[PDB]
Design a protein around this ligand. Structure first.
Ligand code: A1AIJ
Length: 472
């Protein structure tokens, strides 16, 4: 009887739009704390400290103390025991600290904790830890909102994000920074899950397409917001503070939004449900049918396809979260990137969807994975002087991968006995989230050659997409 009550109280109107505007804005900043691990842990050019240079012909002094490296650069991990003045065999690891290049970034976490050379694996692990935190927090919060409400959990998760972010920028050692970020990730996952549930709960009929389109648009704009904010603040201790502070301001205003009116009924909190419904009616201005509500009415109210979807979600999560966090290897000008991604994404997603869906439902699913995977794979062959071509290929690949989610979210999930889609989208989301903690771990394989990470990162989407043609 809840849909009839919602029709009696509203639908579309004013409040159902103010709630969307008030809830979408936190998603922009939520995106900022997931892709922030691209301007915070940025690796500049690091050389070895020398007693000759850098105080107790600059070019000759640099050439005599540091042996030449393989990639046409001074060596980043070794120095000469004694100035080899024979240069008009014996090398010792750096023992006086590195010297970094401060020309685009002032202080990253790499600069402050020397995560270079031998201690290199720790950098692709500080991201897998965050994704494991998101995975854990997206599973714990599921069993903590059906008993504590759907609005209180969001309000407290805002405060948790704010406090954990404001603390994580003031730690003196790596292990604690790898734990407070875990807490931030769990709280962010809770925020996203509850925002989606609240967005759908209050809306009917015109709820499926538009509201879930709004969330994807929010993420796409959050990417541009991340780029713009990173363009301004250059340090890393003043970036986490500036990104985590707005969540406290969101927490204060989050005390006025009404709670879900469908959860209040199944628990017996009829009186407050009535208060919430009448309050919503006044904002919606449809204060004509609300006189009907007199407690009693609310008292009466109170396999192959599945595996294919599993693999598609896993491939999307794997490739996207392994590629979007290393944009220093897809080209240059990191600030210009991370902003063209969303601007490409929205036109690309809309235009690709509109044209391809007319071919068929399976064709759109197939062409949204093979195309970006092949675009990424065809990036190795390009020589390292056509910067525009490789940058365009990478941007197109990421934009198409972003569109794959939408093309597999509301267009897909029908490939089942077709009762309701929240018993399948939620199952796919656990695979998508569990396919990202196995993400940046592939980037640990930069040794044994450097082409292999990109090769795997392009092959996996291609095989996953080509397996979708085997539906029967
Ligand atoms: C776990 C995923 C699949 S990814 C995600 C997790 C945490 N924070 C942000 C995103 C995210 C990033 C870029 C997107 C794009 N384009 C996007 C689109 C839809 C949903 C999430 C994202 C989810 O959240 O379902």
């Amino acid at each position: 009887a809840f849909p009839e009550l919602l029709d009696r109280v509203g639908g579309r109107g004013r409040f159902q739009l103010l709630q969307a505007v008030a809830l979408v804005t936190p998603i922009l900043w939520v995106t900022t704390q997931s892709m922030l691990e691209n301007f915070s842990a940025a690796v500049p050019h690091h050389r070895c400290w020398v007693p000759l240079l850098d105080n107790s012909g600059r070019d000759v002094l640099l050439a005599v103390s540091i042996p030449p490296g393989p990639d046409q650069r001074p060596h980043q991990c070794l120095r000469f025991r004694q100035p080899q003045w024979q240069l008009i065999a014996d090398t010792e690891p750096c023992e006086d600290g590195w010297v970094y290049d401060h020309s685009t970034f002032r202080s990253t976490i790499v600069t402050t904790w020397d995560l270079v050379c031998d201690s290199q694996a720790l950098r692709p692990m500080a991201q897998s830890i965050f994704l494991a935190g998101i995975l854990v927090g997206a599973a714990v919060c599921g069993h903590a909102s059906d008993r504590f409400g759907r609005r209180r959990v969001l309000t407290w998760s805002y405060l948790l994000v704010s406090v954990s972010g404001t603390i994580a920028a003031l730690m003196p050692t790596f292990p604690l920074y790898c734990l407070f970020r875990f807490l931030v990730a769990s709280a962010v996952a809770g925020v996203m899950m509850n925002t989606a549930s609240l967005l759908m709960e209050w809306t009917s009929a015109q709820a499926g397409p538009l509201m879930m389109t709004l969330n994807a648009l929010g993420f796409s704009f959050g990417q541009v917001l991340t780029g713009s904010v990173a363009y301004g603040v250059r340090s890393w201790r003043m970036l986490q503070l500036a990104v985590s502070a707005p969540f406290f301001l969101f927490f204060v205003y989050s005390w006025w939004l009404p709670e879900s009116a469908r959860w209040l009924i199944t628990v017996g909190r009829l009186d407050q449900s009535l208060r919430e419904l009448q309050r919503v009616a006044a904002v919606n201005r449809r204060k004509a049918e609300a006189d009907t509500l007199t407690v009693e009415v609310l008292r009466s109210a109170m396999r192959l396809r599945t595996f294919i979807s599993m693999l598609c979600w896993f491939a999307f999560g794997f490739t996207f979260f392994g590629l979007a966090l290393d944009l220093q290897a897809l080209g240059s000008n990191i600030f210009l990137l991370q902003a063209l991604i969303g601007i490409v994404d929205l036109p690309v997603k809309m235009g690709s969807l509109l044209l391809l869906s007319r071919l068929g439902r399976r064709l759109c699913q197939a062409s949204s994975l093979v195309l970006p995977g092949l675009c990424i794979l065809a990036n190795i062959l390009v020589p390292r002087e056509m910067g525009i071509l490789r940058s365009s290929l990478a941007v197109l690949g990421l934009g198409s991968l972003g569109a794959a989610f939408t093309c597999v979210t509301i267009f897909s999930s029908e490939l089942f006995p077709t009762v309701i889609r929240m018993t399948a989208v939620g199952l796919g989301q656990v695979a998508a989230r569990g396919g990202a903690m196995l993400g940046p771990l592939v980037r640990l394989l930069g040794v044994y050659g450097s082409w292999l990470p990109l090769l795997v990162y392009g092959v996996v989407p291609v095989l996953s997409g080509l397996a979708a043609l085997l539906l029967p």
